[PDB]
Amino acid sequence: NEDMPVERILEAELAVEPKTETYVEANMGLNPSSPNDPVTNICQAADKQLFTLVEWAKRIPHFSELPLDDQVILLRAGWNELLIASFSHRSIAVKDGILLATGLHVHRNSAHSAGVGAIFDRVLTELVSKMRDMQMDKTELGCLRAIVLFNPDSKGLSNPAEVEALREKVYASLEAYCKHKYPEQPGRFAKLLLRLPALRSIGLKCLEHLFFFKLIGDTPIDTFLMEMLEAP
């Protein structure tokens, strides 16, 4: 519509939740599998959300108009931050813990025990609490994720500037959105964009962990998550 209609970004976000129902598969009745390890249950959620991630990107205006190989690149380059941003925002509804797409709730102490505390605490303090405090809505989250998706620095892009232009259109639509919805707060736009530095550092550290839960194996992970982990 307007290059980057904020209504369609919200619809992309809404179309690929949760949102009721999806919160019972393994949180109060049943639960296929039976993995004894928080890292396992999380890697399973990541793997599952990888499929929904593709569909989400397809609903982001102009993503699908890029060459097919460019889309692959963009997703291989941004999947972990995109996934981390989703569950972090989803976890605003819970205290000291994270809500996976599989409807499973991972508590702080479990993560600390599993040995992944610290990285878990950073997620909770640098991402989840920051989103809660400023109460970022789903449209804003959607725009931030779209900004991540449209990374012109990804290696191999056929037209980097075309990607940069798309990212800038999101900058414009989001800013306009903030001024219309939150006129009371002049600095909300910047505060939204400053949520990204922590998303990137936490994502990099996370990738660092994954590349260890692999170069050791012992009861492997799921296909796709493993495919994305073949390095960019």
Binding site: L50, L68, V72, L75, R76, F224, E227, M228, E230
Partner: peptide
């Protein structure tokens, strides 16, 4: 990348 490339071309 089998999965990703496949999922995107449908």
């Amino acid at each position: 990348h089998k999965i990703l490339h496949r999922l995107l071309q449908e």
